[PDB]
Amino acid sequence: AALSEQLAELEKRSGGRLGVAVLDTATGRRFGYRGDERFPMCSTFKALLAAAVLARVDQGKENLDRRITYGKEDLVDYSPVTEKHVGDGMTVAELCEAAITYSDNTAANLLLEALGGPAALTAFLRSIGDNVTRLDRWEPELNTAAPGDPRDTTTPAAMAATLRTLLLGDVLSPASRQQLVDWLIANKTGDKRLRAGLPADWRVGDKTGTGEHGTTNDIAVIWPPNRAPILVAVYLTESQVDADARDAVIAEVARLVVAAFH
């Protein structure tokens, strides 16, 4: 495979450690570059958080319209949505949207408490067959991204398989499935990452993550026109180029991936 070689060249220039997984649902195969190495999730976990929330909505243990109230004491850094709604609160559905489409940290923390904390999300993931991904801390502590730390990590391959299970398998209702898809499709944080290397006709839902030690991630479900989706997980950490160049690394991965498909 020349794809593996291109990603190794790209990884060299980034100065860090690059992980890539592609899962093609039309076939069932999957590609990996460091796909079984641990990487810090940063905000990419928030997709899995909204999935677990939706499961309890499926179970009748939670409601999409339930309004959660909170105060300024609950607000953590980078909370561009929740910081506007302390006076009126926000519904669980609104928090999910904020968490996914803006990486709102306070929304994630509030959703994490309504679920039962990091251990709860981690237990949900084991219940759906993901034995690798783990969430250990809250926002913003889970973004430390220390090079040898297993807390708050996934692997590209595990994240890809989890996305597959959640977005197209049988763990969520079809309604909860479509809702999670629509949130990812409306993400506002990823325009410089995977989206920027994809052909414009391709429909795309994604969740980004950003953290210390030059960490820049993006995970996605992508539908080529008339064709089964693929799942793509990209994690970059310990990188030594600036933010704009780390974004460019992710975009080029998206390009190197689609070219590999033609």
Author numbering: 27 to 58, 60 to 238, 240 to 252, 254 to 291
The authors write:
Here, we explore and test these notions using resurrected Precambrian β-lactamases11 as scaffolds for the engineering of completely new active sites. Of these systems, resurrected Precambrian β-lactamases have been thoroughly characterized in terms of their structure, function and stability. These putative ancestral proteins have been shown to be highly stable and able to efficiently degrade several antibiotics. A hydrophobic-to-ionizable amino acid replacement generates a buried (or partially buried) residue with the perturbed properties that are useful in catalysis and conformational flexibility assists the generation of a completely new active site by facilitating substrate and transition-state binding. We have shown that, when using resurrected Precambrian β-lactamases as scaffolds for protein engineering, a minimalist design approach based on this mechanism leads to levels of catalysis for the Kemp elimination reaction of up to approximately seven orders of magnitude above the rate of the uncatalysed reaction, as well as to significant ester hydrolysis activity.
